[PDB]
């Protein structure tokens, strides 16, 4: 009578639970049903007078306007599922895959929003013609450097972070966020004083400011840009369609169902001063 | 994918699924209580 016990299975098919930290909840999500998106930002500003009583006030400047075009790519994944499985496996496999394909997409475009390159996918802010801060141009992101190559500063450590903060602009620092991968945030937290006590004290905020633990930036290398910071509410624009359109394909793979689903998304940097970076070169 | 405009998109992987079976054992304890105690000890020994 050991064949009478028929082990009860789960109610919900579970899975490994991967990092949903995707910068989407901190960037500027924009609904768009089009081929592209065009932010219209202002690279300069006007001038003011303090006009005297007898001045006959003359002209002043006017903010010249810079367009950045969002490409708004598409993203698709296509699993091959057997028709025999989909009829006899009482867990609802169709809505399981659409619940799982979406979690891959929000995990796939996190690399696009941060370390994505140009072709067929959004450029994350890491590949945007980095310029050291102080000679800050428009069409480029600023960064500060640390000093020593493969680590933080040696003599006065932990000062390359605080000036990265205080070079981000006083308006942008109001609601900003650090961005690191989870293996750099250890090497930040492992920093300690001369006494052996580590100095930095859920949101895992750092110096009060929130930290988004991404999973895409490089670690402490020779010339890597490992630590990001800035106001992503104005700095980065995400353009997308707010649906996950699924097309099941009963015909091509004949004994199979072949789910083809695609949500389409794009977005690159929006305000070049609203993000500062950290180089480890010099 | 990040499929291009002219790509003719091919197959992709699919999460292979691993079952772990819970054994769901039983656990019992069996004290021996005297009938004389259970009738004269006004603290409710059964629910205690």
């Amino acid at each position: 009578g050991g064949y009478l016990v028929d082990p009860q299975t789960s109610e919900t098919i579970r899975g490994v639970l991967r990092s949903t930290a995707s910068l989407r909840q901190i960037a500027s999500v924009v609904n768009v049903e089009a081929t592209s998106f065009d932010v219209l930002v202002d690279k300069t500003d006007m001038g003011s007078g303090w006009a005297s009583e007898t001045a006959a006030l003359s002209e002043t400047a006017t903010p010249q306007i810079d367009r950045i075009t969002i490409p708004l790519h598409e993203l698709a994944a296509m699993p091959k599922a057997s028709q025999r499985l989909l009829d006899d496996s009482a867990f609802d496999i169709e809505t399981w895959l659409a619940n799982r394909i979406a979690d891959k997409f929000a995990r796939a475009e996190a690399a696009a929003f941060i370390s994505g390159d140009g072709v067929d996918k959004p450029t994350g802010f890491l590949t945007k013609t980095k310029v050291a801060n102080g000679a800050w141009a428009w069409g480029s992101l600023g960064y500060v450097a640390t000093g020593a190559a493969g680590d933080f500063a040696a003599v006065n450590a932990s000062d390359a972070v605080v000036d990265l903060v205080y070079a981000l602009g006083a308006e942008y620092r109001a609601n900003a966020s650090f961005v690191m991968n989870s293996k750099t945030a250890g090497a930040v937290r492992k920093m300690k004083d001369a006494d052996g006590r580590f100095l930095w004290a859920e949101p895992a905020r750092l110096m009060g400011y929130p930290v988004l633990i991404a999973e895409d930036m490089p670690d402490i290398a020779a010339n890597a840009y490992a630590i990001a910071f800035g106001d992503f509410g104005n700095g980065y624009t995400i353009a997308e369609r707010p649906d996950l359109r699924v097309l099941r394909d009963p015909f091509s793979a004949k004994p199979h169902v072949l789910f083809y689903a695609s949500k389409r998304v794009g977005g690159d940097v929006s305000d070049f001063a609203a993000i500062k970076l950290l180089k480890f070169a010099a | 994918g990040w499929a291009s405009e002219t790509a003719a998109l091919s197959e992709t992987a699919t999460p292979q699924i691993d079952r772990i079976t819970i054994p769901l054992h039983e656990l019992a304890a069996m004290p021996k209580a005297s009938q004389r105690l259970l009738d004269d000890s006004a603290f409710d020994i059964e629910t205690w």
Binding site: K80, A81, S82, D88 | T14, Q16
Partner: peptide
């Protein structure tokens, strides 16, 4: 997922 033949898929 894939085929019903091998279990792990």
């Amino acid at each position: 997922a894939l085929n019903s033949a091998v279990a792990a898929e």
